[PDB]
PDB file of C-alpha atoms (C1' of nucleotides) and ligand atoms in Angstrom:
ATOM      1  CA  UNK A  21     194.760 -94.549-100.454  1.00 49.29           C
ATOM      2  CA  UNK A  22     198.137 -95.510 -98.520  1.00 50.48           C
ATOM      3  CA  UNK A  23     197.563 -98.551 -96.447  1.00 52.02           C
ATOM      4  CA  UNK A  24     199.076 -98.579 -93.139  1.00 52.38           C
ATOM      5  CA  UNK A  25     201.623-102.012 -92.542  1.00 51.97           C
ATOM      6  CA  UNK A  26     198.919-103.779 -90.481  1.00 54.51           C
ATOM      7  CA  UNK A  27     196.344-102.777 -92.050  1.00 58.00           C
ATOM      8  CA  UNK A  28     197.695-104.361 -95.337  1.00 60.16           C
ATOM      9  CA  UNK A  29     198.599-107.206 -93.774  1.00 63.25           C
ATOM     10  CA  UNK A  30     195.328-108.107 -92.002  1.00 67.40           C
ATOM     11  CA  UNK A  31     193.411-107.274 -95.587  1.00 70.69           C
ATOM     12  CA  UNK A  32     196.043-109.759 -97.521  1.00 69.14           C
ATOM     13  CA  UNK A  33     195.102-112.512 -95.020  1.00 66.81           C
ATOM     14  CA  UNK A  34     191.578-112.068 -95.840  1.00 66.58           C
ATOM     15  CA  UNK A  35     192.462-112.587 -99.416  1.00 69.91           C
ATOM     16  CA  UNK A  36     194.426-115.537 -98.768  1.00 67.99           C
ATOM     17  CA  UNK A  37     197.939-114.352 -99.320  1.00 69.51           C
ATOM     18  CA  UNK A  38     199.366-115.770 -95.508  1.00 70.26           C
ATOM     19  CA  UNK A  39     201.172-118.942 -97.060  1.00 67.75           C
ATOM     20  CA  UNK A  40     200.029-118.174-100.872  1.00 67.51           C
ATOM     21  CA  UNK A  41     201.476-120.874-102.756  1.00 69.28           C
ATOM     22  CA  UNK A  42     204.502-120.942 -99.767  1.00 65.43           C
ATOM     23  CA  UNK A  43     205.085-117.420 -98.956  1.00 70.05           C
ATOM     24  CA  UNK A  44     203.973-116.278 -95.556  1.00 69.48           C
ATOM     25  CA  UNK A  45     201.940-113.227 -94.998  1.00 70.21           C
ATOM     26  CA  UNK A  46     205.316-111.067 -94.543  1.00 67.44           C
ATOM     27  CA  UNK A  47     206.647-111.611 -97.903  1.00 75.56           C
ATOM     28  CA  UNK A  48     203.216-109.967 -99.267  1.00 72.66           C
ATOM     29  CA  UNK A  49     203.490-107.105 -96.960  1.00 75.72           C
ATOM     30  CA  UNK A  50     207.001-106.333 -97.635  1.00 73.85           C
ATOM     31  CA  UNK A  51     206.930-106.623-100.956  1.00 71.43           C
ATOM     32  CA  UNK A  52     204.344-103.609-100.993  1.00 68.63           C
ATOM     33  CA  UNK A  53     206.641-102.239 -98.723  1.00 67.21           C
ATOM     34  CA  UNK A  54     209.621-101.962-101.289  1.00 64.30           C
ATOM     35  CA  UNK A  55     207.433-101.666-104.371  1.00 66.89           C
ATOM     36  CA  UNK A  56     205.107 -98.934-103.856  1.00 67.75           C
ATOM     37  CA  UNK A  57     205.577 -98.188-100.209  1.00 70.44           C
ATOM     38  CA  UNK A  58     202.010 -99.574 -99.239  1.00 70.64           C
ATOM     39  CA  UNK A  59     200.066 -96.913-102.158  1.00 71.21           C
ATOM     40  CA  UNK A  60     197.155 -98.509-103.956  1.00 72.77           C
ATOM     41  CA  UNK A  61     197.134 -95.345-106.598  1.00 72.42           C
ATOM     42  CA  UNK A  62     201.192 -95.790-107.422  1.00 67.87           C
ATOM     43  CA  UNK A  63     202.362 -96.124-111.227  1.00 71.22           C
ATOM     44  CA  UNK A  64     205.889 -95.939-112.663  1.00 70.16           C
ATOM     45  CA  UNK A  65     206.351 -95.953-116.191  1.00 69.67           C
ATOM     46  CA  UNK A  66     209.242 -97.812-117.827  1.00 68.46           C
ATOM     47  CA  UNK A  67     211.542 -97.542-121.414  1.00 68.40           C
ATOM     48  CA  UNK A  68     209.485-100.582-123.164  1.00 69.14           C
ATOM     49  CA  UNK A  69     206.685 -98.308-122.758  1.00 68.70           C
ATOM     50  CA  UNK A  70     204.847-100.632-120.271  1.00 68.74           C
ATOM     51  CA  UNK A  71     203.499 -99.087-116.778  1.00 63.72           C
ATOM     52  CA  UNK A  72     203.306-100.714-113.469  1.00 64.62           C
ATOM     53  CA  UNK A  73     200.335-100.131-111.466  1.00 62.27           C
ATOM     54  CA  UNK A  74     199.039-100.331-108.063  1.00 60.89           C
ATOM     55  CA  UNK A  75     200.285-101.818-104.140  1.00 62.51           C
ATOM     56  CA  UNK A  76     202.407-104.436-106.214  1.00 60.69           C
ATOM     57  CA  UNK A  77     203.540-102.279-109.052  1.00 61.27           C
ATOM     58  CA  UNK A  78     201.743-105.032-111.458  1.00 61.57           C
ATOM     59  CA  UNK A  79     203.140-104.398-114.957  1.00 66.32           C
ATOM     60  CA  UNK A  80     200.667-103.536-118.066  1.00 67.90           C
ATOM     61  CA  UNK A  81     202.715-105.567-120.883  1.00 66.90           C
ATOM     62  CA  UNK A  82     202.286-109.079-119.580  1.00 68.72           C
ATOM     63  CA  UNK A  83     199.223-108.419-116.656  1.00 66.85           C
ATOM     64  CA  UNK A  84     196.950-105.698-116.922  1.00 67.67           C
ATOM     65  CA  UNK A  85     195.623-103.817-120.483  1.00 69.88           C
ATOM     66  CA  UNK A  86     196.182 -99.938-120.147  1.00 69.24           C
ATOM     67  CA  UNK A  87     195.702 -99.921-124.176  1.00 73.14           C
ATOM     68  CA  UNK A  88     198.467 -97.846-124.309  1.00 72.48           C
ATOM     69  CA  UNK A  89     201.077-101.032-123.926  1.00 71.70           C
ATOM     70  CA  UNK A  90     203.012-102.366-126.875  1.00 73.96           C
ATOM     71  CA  UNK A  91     202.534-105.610-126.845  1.00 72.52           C
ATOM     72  CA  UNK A  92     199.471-106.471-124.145  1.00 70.79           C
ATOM     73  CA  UNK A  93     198.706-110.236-123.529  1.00 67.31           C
ATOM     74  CA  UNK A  94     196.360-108.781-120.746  1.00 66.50           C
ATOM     75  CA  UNK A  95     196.989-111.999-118.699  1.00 66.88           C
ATOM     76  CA  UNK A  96     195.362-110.928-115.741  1.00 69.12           C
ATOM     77  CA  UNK A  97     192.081-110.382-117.998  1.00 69.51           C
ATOM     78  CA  UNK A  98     191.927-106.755-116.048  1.00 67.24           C
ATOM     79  CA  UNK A  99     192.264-102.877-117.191  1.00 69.26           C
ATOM     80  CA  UNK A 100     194.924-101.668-115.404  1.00 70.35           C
ATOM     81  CA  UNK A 101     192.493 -99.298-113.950  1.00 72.09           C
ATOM     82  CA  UNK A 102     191.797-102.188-111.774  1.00 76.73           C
ATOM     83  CA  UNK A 103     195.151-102.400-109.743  1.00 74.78           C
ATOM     84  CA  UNK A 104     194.674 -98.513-108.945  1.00 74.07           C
ATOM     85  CA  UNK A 105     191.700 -99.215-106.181  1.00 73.46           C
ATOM     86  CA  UNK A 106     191.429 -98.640-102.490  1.00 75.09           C
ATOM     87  CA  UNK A 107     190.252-102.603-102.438  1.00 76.22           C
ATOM     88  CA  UNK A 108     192.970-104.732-103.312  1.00 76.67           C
ATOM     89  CA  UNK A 109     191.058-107.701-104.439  1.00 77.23           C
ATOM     90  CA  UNK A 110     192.174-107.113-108.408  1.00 79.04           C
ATOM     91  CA  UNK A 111     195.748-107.269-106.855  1.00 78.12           C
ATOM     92  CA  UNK A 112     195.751-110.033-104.638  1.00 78.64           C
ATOM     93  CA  UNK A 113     194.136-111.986-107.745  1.00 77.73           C
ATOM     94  CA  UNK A 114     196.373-110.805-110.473  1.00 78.52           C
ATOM     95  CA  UNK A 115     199.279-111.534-107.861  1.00 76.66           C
ATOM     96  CA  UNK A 116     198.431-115.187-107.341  1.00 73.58           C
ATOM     97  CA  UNK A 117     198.783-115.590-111.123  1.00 73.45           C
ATOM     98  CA  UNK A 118     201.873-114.410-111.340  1.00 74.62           C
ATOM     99  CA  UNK A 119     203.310-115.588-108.112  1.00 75.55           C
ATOM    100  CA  UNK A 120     201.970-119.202-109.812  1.00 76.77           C
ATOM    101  CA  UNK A 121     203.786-118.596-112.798  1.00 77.13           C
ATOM    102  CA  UNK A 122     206.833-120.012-112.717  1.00 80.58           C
ATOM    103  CA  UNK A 123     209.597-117.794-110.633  1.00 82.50           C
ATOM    104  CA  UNK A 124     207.570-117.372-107.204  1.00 85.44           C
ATOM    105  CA  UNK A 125     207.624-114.180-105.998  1.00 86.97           C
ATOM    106  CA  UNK A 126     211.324-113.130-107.709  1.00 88.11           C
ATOM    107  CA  UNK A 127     208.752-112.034-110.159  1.00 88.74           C
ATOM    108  CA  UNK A 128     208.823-108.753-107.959  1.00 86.84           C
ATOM    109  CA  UNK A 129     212.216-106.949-107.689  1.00 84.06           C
ATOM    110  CA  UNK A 130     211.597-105.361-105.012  1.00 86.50           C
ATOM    111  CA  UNK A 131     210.768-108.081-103.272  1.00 81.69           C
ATOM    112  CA  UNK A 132     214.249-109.900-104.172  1.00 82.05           C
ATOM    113  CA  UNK A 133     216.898-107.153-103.112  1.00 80.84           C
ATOM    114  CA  UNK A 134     214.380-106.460-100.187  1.00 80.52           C
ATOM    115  CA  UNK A 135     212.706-108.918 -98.673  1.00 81.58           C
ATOM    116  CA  UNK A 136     214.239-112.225-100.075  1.00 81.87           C
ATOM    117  CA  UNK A 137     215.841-114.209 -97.228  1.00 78.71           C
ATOM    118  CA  UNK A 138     215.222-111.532 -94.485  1.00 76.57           C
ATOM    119  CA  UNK A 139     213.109-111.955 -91.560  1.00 75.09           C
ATOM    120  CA  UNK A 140     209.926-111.322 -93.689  1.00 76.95           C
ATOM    121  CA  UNK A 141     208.241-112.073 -90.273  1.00 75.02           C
ATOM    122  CA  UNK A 142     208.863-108.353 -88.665  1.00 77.77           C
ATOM    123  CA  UNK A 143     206.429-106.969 -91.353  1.00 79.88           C
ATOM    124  CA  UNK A 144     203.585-108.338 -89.139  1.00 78.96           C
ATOM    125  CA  UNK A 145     204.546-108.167 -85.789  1.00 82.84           C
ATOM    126  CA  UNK A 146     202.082-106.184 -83.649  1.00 83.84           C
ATOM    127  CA  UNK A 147     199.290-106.462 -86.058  1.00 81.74           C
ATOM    128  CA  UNK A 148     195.984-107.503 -85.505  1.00 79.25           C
ATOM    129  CA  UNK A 149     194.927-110.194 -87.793  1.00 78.88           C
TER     130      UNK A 149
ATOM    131  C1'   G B  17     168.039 -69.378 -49.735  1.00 81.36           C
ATOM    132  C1'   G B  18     172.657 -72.631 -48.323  1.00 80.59           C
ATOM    133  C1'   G B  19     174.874 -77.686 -45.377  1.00 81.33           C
ATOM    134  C1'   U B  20     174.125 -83.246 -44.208  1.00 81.35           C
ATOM    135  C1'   U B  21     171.570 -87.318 -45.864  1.00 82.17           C
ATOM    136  C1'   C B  22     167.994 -89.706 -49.123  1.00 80.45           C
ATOM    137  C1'   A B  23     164.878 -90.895 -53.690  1.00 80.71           C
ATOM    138  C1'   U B  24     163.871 -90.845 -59.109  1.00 78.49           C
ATOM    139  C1'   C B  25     166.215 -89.209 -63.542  1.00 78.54           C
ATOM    140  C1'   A B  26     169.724 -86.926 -67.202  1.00 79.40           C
ATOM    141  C1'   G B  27     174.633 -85.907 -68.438  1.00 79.38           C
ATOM    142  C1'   G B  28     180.185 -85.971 -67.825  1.00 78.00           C
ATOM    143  C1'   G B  29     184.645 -87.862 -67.332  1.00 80.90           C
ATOM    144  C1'   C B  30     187.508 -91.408 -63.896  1.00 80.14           C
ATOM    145  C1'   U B  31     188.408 -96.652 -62.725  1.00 82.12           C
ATOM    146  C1'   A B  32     196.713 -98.394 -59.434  1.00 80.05           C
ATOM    147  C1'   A B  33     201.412 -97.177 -61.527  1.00 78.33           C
ATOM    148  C1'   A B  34     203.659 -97.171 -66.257  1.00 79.00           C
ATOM    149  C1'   G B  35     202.372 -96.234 -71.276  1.00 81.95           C
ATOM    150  C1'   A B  36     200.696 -92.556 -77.392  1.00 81.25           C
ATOM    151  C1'   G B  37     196.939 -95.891 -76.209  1.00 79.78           C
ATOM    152  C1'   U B  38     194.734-100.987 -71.742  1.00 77.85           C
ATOM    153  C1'   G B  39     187.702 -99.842 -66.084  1.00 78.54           C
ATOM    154  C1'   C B  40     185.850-105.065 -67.128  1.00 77.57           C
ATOM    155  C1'   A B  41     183.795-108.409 -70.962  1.00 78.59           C
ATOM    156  C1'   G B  42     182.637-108.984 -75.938  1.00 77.63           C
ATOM    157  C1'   A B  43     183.203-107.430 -81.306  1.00 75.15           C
ATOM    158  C1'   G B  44     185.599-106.400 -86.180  1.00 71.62           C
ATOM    159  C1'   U B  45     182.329-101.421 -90.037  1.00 73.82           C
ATOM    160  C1'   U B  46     190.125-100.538 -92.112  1.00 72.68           C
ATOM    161  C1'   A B  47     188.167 -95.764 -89.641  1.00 71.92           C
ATOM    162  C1'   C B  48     192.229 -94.033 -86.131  1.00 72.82           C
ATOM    163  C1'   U B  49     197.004 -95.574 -84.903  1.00 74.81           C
ATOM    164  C1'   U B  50     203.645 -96.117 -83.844  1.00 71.74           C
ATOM    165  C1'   A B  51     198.360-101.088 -85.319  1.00 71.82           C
ATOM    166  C1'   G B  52     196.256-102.417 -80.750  1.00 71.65           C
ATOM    167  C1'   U B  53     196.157-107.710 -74.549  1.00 67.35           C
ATOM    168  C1'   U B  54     195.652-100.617 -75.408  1.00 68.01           C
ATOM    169  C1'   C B  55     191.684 -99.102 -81.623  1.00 67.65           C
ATOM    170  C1'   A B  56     185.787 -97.563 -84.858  1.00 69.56           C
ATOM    171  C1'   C B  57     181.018-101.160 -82.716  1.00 69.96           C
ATOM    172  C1'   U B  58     178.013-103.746 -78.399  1.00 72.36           C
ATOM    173  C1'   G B  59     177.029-104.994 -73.187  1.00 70.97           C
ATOM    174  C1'   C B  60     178.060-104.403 -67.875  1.00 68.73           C
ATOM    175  C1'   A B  61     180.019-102.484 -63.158  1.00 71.13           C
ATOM    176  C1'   G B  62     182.179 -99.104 -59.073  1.00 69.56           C
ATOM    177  C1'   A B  63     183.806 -94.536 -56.820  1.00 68.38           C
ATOM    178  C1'   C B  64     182.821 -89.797 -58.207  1.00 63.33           C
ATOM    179  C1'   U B  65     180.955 -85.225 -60.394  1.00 66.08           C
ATOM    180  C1'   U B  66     177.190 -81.862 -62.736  1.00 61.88           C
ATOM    181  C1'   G B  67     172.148 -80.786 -63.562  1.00 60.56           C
ATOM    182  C1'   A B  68     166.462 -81.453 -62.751  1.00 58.36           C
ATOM    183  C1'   C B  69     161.485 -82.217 -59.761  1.00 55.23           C
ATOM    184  C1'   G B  70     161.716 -83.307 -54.839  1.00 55.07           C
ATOM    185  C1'   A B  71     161.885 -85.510 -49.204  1.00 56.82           C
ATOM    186  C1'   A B  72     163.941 -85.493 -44.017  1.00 53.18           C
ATOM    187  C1'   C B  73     166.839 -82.642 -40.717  1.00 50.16           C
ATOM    188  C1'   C B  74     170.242 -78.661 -39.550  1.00 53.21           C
ATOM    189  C1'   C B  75     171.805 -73.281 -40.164  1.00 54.43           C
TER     190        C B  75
HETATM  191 MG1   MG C  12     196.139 -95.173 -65.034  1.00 57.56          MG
HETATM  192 MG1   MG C  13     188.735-104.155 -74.744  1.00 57.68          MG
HETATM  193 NA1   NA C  14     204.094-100.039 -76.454  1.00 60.29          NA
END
RNA sequence: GGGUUCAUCAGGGCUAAAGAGUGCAGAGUUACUUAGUUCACUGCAGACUUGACGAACCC
């Protein structure tokens, strides 16, 4: 499944994202946006041998157990399986960990060279929420 | 058997213009969509239109 932008962004509010430890709801929706351009079944591997999985490309060496990671702490206490569902609740959840962690949300990339400083608020304009 | 009107039903859109989308009032199953005052679901109304068993009158 690829969520459409509103569509995202209403089903983020219902999980509580809109002002998630600061961030307002269009930080959440354009950080999908940038990292896996709104697809719930996206993965990109990477050098360390770690994956990223999911609408927030959630990494499997810190977050999520693939068992095929070097070096799991499974921090999320989720298969990465998880992250690759049409319902984003294993997301949202493994998100507010690490958006809790210690960085905010320059924990995702994308969301730095992207959405950082922009007006995050154009993400949700015209949606229904 | 056809016209005008009427009655009881069934169905179908339409409800200024503009606009992809808005008849009015609700709703929220994420479906559809460029998200939407316009969209899946539920009421309700008007002018029509089609069909059915008919009635009055006219040809
Ligand atoms: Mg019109
Ligand atoms: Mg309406
Ligand atoms: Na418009």
């Amino acid at each position: 499944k690829v969520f459409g932008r509103c569509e995202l962004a209403a089903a983020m509010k219902r999980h509580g994202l809109d002002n998630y430890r600061g961030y307002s709801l269009g930080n959440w929706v354009c950080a999908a946006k940038f990292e896996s351009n709104f697809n719930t079944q996206a993965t990109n591997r990477n050098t360390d041998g770690s994956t990223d999985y999911g609408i927030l490309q959630i990494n499997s060496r810190w977050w999520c157990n693939d068992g095929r990671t070097p070096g799991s702490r499974n921090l999320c206490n989720i298969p990465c399986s998880a992250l690759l569902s049409s319902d984003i609740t294993a997301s949202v959840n493994c998100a507010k960990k690490i958006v809790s962690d210690g960085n905010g949300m320059n924990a995702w990339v994308a969301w730095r060279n992207r959405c950082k400083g922009t007006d995050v608020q154009a993400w949700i304009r015209g949606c229904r929420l």
